[PDB]
Design a protein around this nucleic acid. Structure first.
Ligand SMILES: [Mn+2]
Ligand SMILES: [Mn+2]
Ligand SMILES: [Mn+2]
Ligand SMILES: [Mn+2]
Ligand code: NA
Length: 348
DNA sequence: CGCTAGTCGACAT
DNA sequence: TCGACTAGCG
């Protein structure tokens, strides 16, 4: 996510209860629940010892939403995004490192720290996610496996008007241009909501409350697709966008040092990386549940060439995309591991 | 002082 | 894929 974004725009936030959305549809970034539930059994997950606790943990929240008359759509991550491979590598390295370290501390004698290491080695696999999918489907809850990041999928579901709000712990969804996002929701329904249109309640943002400029700010501050320049965070990026009054962003990015009264040399590849990051936020592939078709998050504008956007996710056949979305197709082996059919009585 | 980057408990049961 | 907290910076 965008580090400290929630704190930066805290004025646009509002404490709520999910009963606000009774008789409505809400999409869920299920990974958060999955992780929080996986914490309660980190050791057994690390050792490979069998446990299905995260399932019950997620189903608690699901049953809560269902109890408050909410129609929940559980969304899951799919294939790895090429423009996110660095962060994936780092995360993986941290995971195996902390795993081995914990395994060592188990032999040393210190379990209190070994457990804490096992917490950092949490690896949420597609199998666990599929268990959760099984449970949710047994409780009549619609599930959707994103072709890539669940973030973009949720953003699409919200923009398309399929869902009214998004439940997540990740502030990336705001950069994607979600309308309504519910952060920090507990097991009872208490949560914090940020509306896009209410970003203007943040005086600190200045005139950076439009989707495009807000996105630019989030990218410049540092995201999962492009690391920020050293010494650059939300405040300075927002300052850059505030002080500058130019339509073309590239020139401003080239004058970032000028706008911040600093000596900031911008590498040539950083501009290209910014273009790539922007295009990743705008055009990352998602799955249209209605038309059952792979589409970019936003329709391609005239100023972009879709053939250069491989990093935003590659296209596959719509039937394969469908089988992935249903969770029937294994992400890694591309083999069919289930036979769920929505026609045999979200997908029309 | 304001802001960024990095650490470690919390996460949760 | 978190965030309070804070060393340590300009
Ligand atoms: Mn993120
Ligand atoms: Mn794929
Ligand atoms: Mn995500
Ligand atoms: Mn994200
Ligand atoms: Na940054």
């Amino acid at each position: 996510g965008i580090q400290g974004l929630l704190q930066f725009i805290k004025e646009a936030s509002e404490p709520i209860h999910v009963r606000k959305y009774k008789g409505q549809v809400v999409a869920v970034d299920t990974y958060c629940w999955l992780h929080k539930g996986a914490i309660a059994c980190a050791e057994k997950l690390a050792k490979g010892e069998p446990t299905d606790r995260y399932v019950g943990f997620c189903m608690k929240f699901v049953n809560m939403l269902l109890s408050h008359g909410i129609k929940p759509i559980l969304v899951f991550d799919g294939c790895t995004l090429p423009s996110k491979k660095e962060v994936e590598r780092s995360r993986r390295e941290r995971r195996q490192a902390n795993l081995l370290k914990g395994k060592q501390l188990l032999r040393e004698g210190k379990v209190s720290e070994a457990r804490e290491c096992f917490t950092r080695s949490i690896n949420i696999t597609h199998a666990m996610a599929h268990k959760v999918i099984k449970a949710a489907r047994s409780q009549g809850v619609d599930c959707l496996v994103a072709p890539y990041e669940a973030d973009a999928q949720l953003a699409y579901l919200n923009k398309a008007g399929i869902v009214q709000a998004i439940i997540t712990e990740d502030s990336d969804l705001l950069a994607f241009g979600c309308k309504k996002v519910i952060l920090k929701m507990d097991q009872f329904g208490n949560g914090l909501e940020i509306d896009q249109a209410r970003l203007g309640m943040c005086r600190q943002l200045g005139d950076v409350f439009t989707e495009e400029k807000f996105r630019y700010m989030c990218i410049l501050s540092g995201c999962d697709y492009l690391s920020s320049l050293r010494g650059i965070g939300l405040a300075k990026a927002c300052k850059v966008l505030r002080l500058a009054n130019n339509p073309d962003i590239v020139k401003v990015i080239k004058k970032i040092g000028h706008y911040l009264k600093m000596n900031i040399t911008v590498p040539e590849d950083y501009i290209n990386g910014f273009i790539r990051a922007n295009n990743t936020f705008l055009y990352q592939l998602v799955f249209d549940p209605i038309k059952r078709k792979l589409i970019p998050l936003n329709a391609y504008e005239d100023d972009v060439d879709p053939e250069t956007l491989s990093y935003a996710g590659q296209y596959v056949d719509d039937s394969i995309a469908l089988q992935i979305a249903l969770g029937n197709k294994d992400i890694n082996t591309f083999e069919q591991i289930d036979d769920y059919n929505p026609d045999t009585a979200l997908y029309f």
